[PDB]
Design a protein around this ligand. Structure first.
Ligand SMILES: C[C@@H](C(=O)O)N(C)C(=O)OCc1ccccc1
Ligand code: NA
Length: 330
């Protein structure tokens, strides 16, 4: 089997991407944030505290003929940005882009933090990291990908995120029309439960490539590119008037600037992030200070190849017995 679903930016900045997901019988379609940096599939629901719901579509298990309470199971998750959610668990039928899993754990939120409530466009998360990170207790649950894997034509999924445009998540096949040149594959460590890999270095604009190992995660659920302070300083030093602000919490720069590209290494290959991808617009409405898309990973404890980096590539998440990542230009 295979599946193929379109993923759409939630706003004009590509702050996140949403993908429609069918849950239950008859189908209830929710727009979920596919997150390769976490391992829970959780939704706004009929159980979510009413004051914490503001415009999201909810899953109502009592209206699904295939929903079953997973008796005694609870979940609670905290993300890198400080946001959180928790609740109880149902099993139900879940379909993505025509690929169906029966018996998927659907984590129903009883509580969500303010950042979720305030984002009316995201109805929940679908985690695509390794199932070792799933938070369900006392019986840990599998991700949608892990439950689908054995049925897929090939044990893979691909992320093809758009810049200010829709893109695609495919399951079970690699669309050879969706990228240019060849795919370069690189080793993955599952020791922390992430799609963790080592980039071979970077370049700023038309500058020389610096060969250096950068260990980080491929995380579709993180907006920006978080790299070591040395690398980030070298990037922003090429933009006149750019500076790290604490008041803002990151590098800002003149909205009048033209940003340089940023290149990262995948083995001997190179992925180029155009400068425009690094512009996250005014810090506040009407400001002439703009927020940068490359930021320091200092204090976060890991480097994160978030959407800024991933959207410049066709990315293959290879869940074979020894997982790997692949990257192609597009
Ligand atoms: C041969 C290798 C390399 O860069 O040395 N290469 C081109 C390559 O794609 O390696 C992919 C891979 C990594 C880990 C386990 C299996 C496969
Ligand atoms: Na922000």
């Amino acid at each position: 089997s295979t599946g193929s679903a379109t993923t759409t930016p939630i706003d004009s900045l590509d702050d996140a991407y949403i993908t429609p997901v069918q849950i239950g019988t008859p189908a209830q379609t929710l727009n979920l944030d596919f997150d390769t940096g976490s391992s829970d599939l959780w939704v706004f629901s009929s159980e979510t505290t009413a004051s914490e719901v503001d415009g999201q579509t909810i899953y109502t298990p009592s209206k699904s003929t295939t929903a079953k309470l997973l008796s005694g199971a609870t979940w609670s998750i905290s993300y890198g940005d400080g946001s959180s959610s928790s609740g109880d668990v149902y099993t139900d039928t879940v379909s993505v882009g025509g690929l169906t899993v029966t018996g998927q754990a659907v984590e129903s939120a009883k509580k969500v933090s303010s950042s979720f409530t305030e984002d009316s466009t995201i109805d929940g998360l679908l985690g695509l990291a390794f199932s070792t990170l799933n938070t369900v207790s006392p019986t840990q649950q599998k991700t949608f990908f892990d439950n689908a894997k054995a049925s897929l034509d090939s044990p893979v999924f691909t992320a093809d995120l758009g810049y200010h445009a829709p893109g695609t998540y495919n399951f079970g096949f690699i669309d050879t029309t969706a990228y240019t040149g060849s795919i370069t594959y690189t080793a993955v460590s599952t020791k922390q439960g992430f799609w963790e890999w080592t980039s071979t270095g970077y370049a700023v604009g038309s500058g020389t490539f610096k060969s250096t190992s950068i260990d980080g995660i491929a995380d579709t659920g993180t907006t920006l590119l978080y790299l070591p302070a040395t690398v980030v300083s070298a990037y922003w030093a090429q933009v006149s008037g750019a500076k790290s602000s604490s008041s803002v919490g990151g590098y800002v720069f003149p909205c009048s600037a033209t940003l340089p590209s940023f290149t990262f290494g995948v083995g001997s290959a190179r992925i180029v992030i155009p400068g425009d991808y690094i512009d996250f617009g005014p810090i506040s409405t009407g400001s002439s200070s703009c927020f940068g898309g490359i930021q320091s990973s200092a204090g976060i404890g890991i480097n994160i190849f978030g959407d800024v980096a991933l959207k410049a590539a066709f990315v293959v998440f290879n869940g074979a017995t020894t997982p790997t990542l692949g990257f192609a230009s597009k």
